[PDB]
Every structure is written in C-alpha cells, then in structure tokens.
Design an enzyme around this catalytic site. Structure first.
Site, PDB file in Angstrom:
ATOM      1  N   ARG A 288       4.305 -14.083   8.593  1.00  0.00           N
ATOM      2  CA  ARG A 288       4.866 -12.742   8.746  1.00  0.00           C
ATOM      3  C   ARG A 288       6.200 -12.838   9.467  1.00  0.00           C
ATOM      4  O   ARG A 288       6.370 -13.663  10.363  1.00  0.00           O
ATOM      5  CB  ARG A 288       3.915 -11.821   9.525  1.00  0.00           C
TER       6      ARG A 288
ATOM      7  N   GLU B 235       0.862  -1.178   0.000  1.00  0.00           N
ATOM      8  CA  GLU B 235       0.000   0.000   0.000  1.00  0.00           C
ATOM      9  C   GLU B 235       0.897   1.226   0.000  1.00  0.00           C
ATOM     10  O   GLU B 235       1.865   1.284   0.755  1.00  0.00           O
ATOM     11  CB  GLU B 235      -0.921   0.010   1.221  1.00  0.00           C
ATOM     12  CG  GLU B 235      -1.929  -1.125   1.262  1.00  0.00           C
ATOM     13  CD  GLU B 235      -2.899  -0.984   2.411  1.00  0.00           C
ATOM     14  OE1 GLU B 235      -2.436  -0.681   3.538  1.00  0.00           O
ATOM     15  OE2 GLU B 235      -4.125  -1.158   2.183  1.00  0.00           O
TER      16      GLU B 235
ATOM     17  N   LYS C  72       2.448  -1.037  12.185  1.00  0.00           N
ATOM     18  CA  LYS C  72       2.210   0.330  11.700  1.00  0.00           C
ATOM     19  C   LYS C  72       2.073   1.307  12.868  1.00  0.00           C
ATOM     20  O   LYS C  72       2.731   2.364  12.895  1.00  0.00           O
ATOM     21  CB  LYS C  72       0.980   0.407  10.777  1.00  0.00           C
TER      22      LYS C  72
END
Length: 507
Positions: free
Chosen positions: A241, A28, A251
């Site tokens: 992950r 993103e 984040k």
C-alpha cells in the site's frame, strides 16, 4: 554478460508464454478515489497496456452501498483523468451474486463451509472453533438456504468457510463468506438479503472475469477458494500500500477530516483524493510520474511528500505560464515617472506611475545583507527597471501602506554598475482583484485522524492578479499559472465573485 538491458522484452516473452493479459481495477463504489488508487491504476492499466491487453473496470459493489451511482461517475472521471482506458464496458461484482451463491453451496456440499450461530462478538473473540463447525452438510445447506430465504435476521447467523482456526493464515481461521443484511441494493434491488464478504467475492470475481493477473494482504485464501471450487485460477500479485509523509489515506481519518470541517469538501486541495489533487492543480502526468518513481515493492515503505511535490513541480515547470500576482499588496508610487503607460513584452504587461509589490518583499528595518526593498535600497523589477525606495507613508496604525520610489531607465540589468535582488510586481493598469489561496501540508509531522493537523494549512489573501491570468478562457479552472517568484497556481474550480487561485505547489 549472460543477462539483460531492454530485456523488458524477454520477460515480456516469459509472461506471454507463461500464460492476452487481462488485469482489473476494482474499487468499491462507496467513496472517492485517492492517491493509493492512483498507484493501483498505473499498475493495472499500465500492465495491460504494456502487453497490449485489457484492464477491466470493476465496481466491487458486493453489498448495498448508498450512493453507488455517484461514485461510479466519480471513479470513471478520475480514472479517465489519470489516463486509464477500460473497455466501452463497465463491470460489477453484484452481477455475480448468483454464481457466488451457487459456489458457496458447493463449498457446503464439500464440507468446506458451515453456518455459525455465534455472534460477531463471539466470532471476533474466538478467532477457538465455533460450536457449530461439525454441523452436517445437510443441516448447513438447509440453514444457508433459509438464510437466503430471509427467515432469520441480521447477524443472527453467518456462513463461514471451514479451514483451520489454528493455522495463522492469519485470515484463514474460518473466514466469513456470507453475512445476512436486510437492506436493498442499488443494482440488485430486492433480489438478495444475504451478501458475500470481500474476501469470498474478490478472487471469484477475478475468476469469473478471466482476469489473468490480479494486482492488489494474503493470497493463501484467494488460492484456497479457487483451488477448492475448483474454477479458473488467476495469478495473484500483491504489492505494498502507498504511504506518503504528512498525509493520511484511511477511510476513517479522511471522513473525519471532511465531516469535522478540517478541510472543505472531498475535493479540497489539501486532501490526497484524486479530486482534491486535481483541484489543487496537480496535472495527471505528475501523478503517473510519481507512481513510477515510487516503484513496486512487496515490503511496506513510505515515500516522502517531497518526491510528490518534485513530480508535480517538474511537471508544472514544463507547461506553466508566467504571470504576475500580488498576494499581500502594498502600493508603490514612482516619484519620477509621471503619467503615460509604457508596454512591455516578456501576454500584455505594462509599466506606470502606480505599482504594487508584495508585502514580504519590503522591510522597513532590514537585516544587514538583505536583497529586496527597504528605505534607501534598490531592487530590480523582473522584466522592467530598478526602483529605489525613498520615503514611506504609513496609516494611522503606523502600518506602511505606500512606498515612494524613484526609478531608473536602464531596464533589464547596470550602467553603473550594481544590482542585488529582483522581485515581482504589478502595474495598477494591469491588476485585477483576486483571492489567492496559499495551501500547506495537511499535517505538521511526517508520521501522524490524530489531530496533529496544520492549523495554518490554508491562508486566504485578497490580492491582485495580472489581468490575462483571470482570462478564464485562456486559463480555465485547472490550467497552469506560474505566478512569478510566488509559486505554481491554478485557478480554482470544482471536481464533482472574486476570481480564485490555489497554490498547487511552491518554488
């Protein structure tokens, strides 16, 4: 036998026949890449290269992201730096906004999507049924159409896939497809006032793009959309992950660390962003190597930072340049040398009456059995002679500020014999003022933004550096210096006055 070896080749044939391969790296564009993305990058670019295929660089800009273009630049930078090769072509999820919308209409037409009037509250609670699930196709379709038309307002209504609330997908209990957001897009401008959620857009993006192997957690939903749509199917491969001890990559926690000034900018060396790692002085190959030594795994684990540090240290070790640096200077006068300034080859290195050693290498009242300098004691100066400390001068505070030392012609060695320890050093003739930054791990415990944060993660010294190390043409802002007996250092830069150097890694 009956098996394997470099039967990489045979399984290459199974994938080759069971299908050119086409992967995607789809960040993103709303934030700088970090170490996790490096794992993805090696996987996707790695896989396409291995098969002589293609890996698309896709920006998932599925809703209005503030500084999209900044992140587009940053991402291209970091992916090039890591060594990924996308086309000459950039891909964008926003490019698919219409097709996505059309497919959503198809879902309503198949009675597989409906409009929910319940709130985000009511929804995150009831996840049982919406009160609106059994809405007719006609009504759903009309309501969605008006949603696009911008007649209702943010969050009042939402379009959802109609699956099973029961079935523990888990995110298969009527996932949200379209949210209504009355904000403009960097790229789509004012053409859309409803936008698709990540889950709805992701696999359909893959599909539109003919991605063969999508590497990303649950793919019953991904498969569900492709099945019911019923469009080009794409094989979804999911791995774990990345997690590294003494490190966070959320984040939220990262944004806290920056905003709350725990670190200094997104390119700070203590941060696990690609920018920060690049500025720390880690070379891309160390990262590629690390991502190889972490390995694929469906099951979630955690790699100890020591693996990282070993990767970067082993890499730096191959290509670093030996140079002398003093972080906490203390003066040495050679008592039996006089003037004249002797050259040494070991790069220009001199020896003279006036040296510097590092404070940690001298001790006024040493423990028994102690290599390194002390009154009465003798040490080897790397690439030079042995000095013996006889006398020290202190300042008004009692702090040692100069060492008075005899030397001994008989350089790299012992004539006696003898020996003991060796230390690093600098001739005044060779020193230039420098800011030496010693960076630690961001955190203090392996498994913590949970402020158990190293308060000593950055100590800054005003010290000296061997002149050629500040050459700047010879050593530009992320070249590799090995400051002898001190650590691996890179000259500081920025990944968008005193000369500054960062500790990239110890030993």
């Amino acid at each position: 036998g009956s098996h394997m070896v470099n039967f990489l080749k045979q399984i290459v044939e199974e994938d080759l026949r069971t299908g050119t391969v086409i992967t995607r790296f789809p960040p993103e564009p709303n934030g700088f890449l970090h170490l996790g993305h490096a794992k993805s990058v090696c996987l996707n670019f790695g896989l396409a290269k291995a098969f002589g295929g293609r890996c698309h660089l896709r920006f998932d800009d599925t809703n209005p992201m503030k500084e999209e273009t900044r992140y587009i630049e940053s991402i291209q930078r970091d992916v090039r730096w890591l060594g990924g090769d996308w086309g000459n072509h950039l891909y964008y999820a926003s490019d698919y906004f219409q097709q996505l919308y059309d497919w959503a209409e198809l879902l309503i037409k198949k009675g597989l999507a409906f409009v929910d009037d319940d709130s985000l509250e009511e929804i995150r609670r009831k996840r049982e049924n919406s009160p609106f699930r059994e809405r007719s196709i006609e009504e759903n379709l009309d309501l969605f159409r008006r949603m696009r038309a911008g007649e209702f307002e943010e969050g009042s209504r939402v379009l959802r896939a109609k699956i099973d609330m029961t079935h523990s997908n888990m995110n298969m209990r009527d996932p949200v497809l379209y949210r209504i957001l009355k904000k403009e897009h960097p790229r789509t401008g004012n053409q859309w006032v409803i936008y698709p959620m990540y889950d709805y857009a992701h696999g359909q993006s893959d599909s539109i793009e003919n991605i063969t192997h999508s590497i990303c957690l649950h793919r019953i939903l991904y498969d569900w959309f492709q099945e019911k749509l019923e469009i080009t199917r794409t094989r979804q491969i999911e791995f774990a992950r990345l997690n590294v001890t003494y490190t966070v990559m959320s984040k939220r926690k990262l944004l806290a660390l920056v905003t709350e000034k725990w670190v200094d900018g997104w390119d700070d060396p203590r941060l696990p962003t690609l920018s920060g790692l690049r500025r720390r002085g880690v070379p891309p190959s160390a990262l590629r190597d690390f991502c190889d030594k972490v390995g694929v795994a469906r099951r979630e684990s955690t790699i100890k930072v020591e693996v990282l540090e070993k990767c970067i240290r082993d890499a730096l070790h191959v290509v670093a340049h030996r140079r002398f640096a003093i972080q906490d200077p203390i003066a040495v006068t050679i008592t039996n040398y006089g003037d004249k300034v002797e050259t040494i080859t070991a790069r220009e290195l001199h020896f003279s009456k006036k040296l510097y050693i590092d404070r940690d290498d001298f001790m006024e009242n040493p423990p028994a059995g102690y290599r390194r300098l002390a009154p009465g004691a003798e040490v080897r100066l790397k690439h030079a002679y042995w000095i013996k400390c006889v006398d020290v001068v202190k300042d008004a505070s009692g702090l040692v500020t100069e060492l008075l030392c005899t030397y001994d012609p008989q350089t790299k060695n012992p004539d006696g014999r003898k020996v003991k320890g060796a230390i690093h050093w600098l001739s005044e003739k060779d020193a230039v003022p420098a800011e030496i930054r010693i960076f630690g791990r961001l955190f203090t415990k392996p498994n913590p933004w949970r402020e158990n944060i190293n308060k000593e993660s950055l100590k800054v010294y005003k010290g000296f550096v061997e002149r050629s190390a500040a050459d700047s043409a010879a050593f530009p802002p992320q070249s590799s210096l090995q400051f002898e007996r001190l650590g691996f250092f890179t000259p500081d830069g920025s990944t968008l006055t005193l000369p500054v150097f960062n500790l990239t890694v110890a030993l």
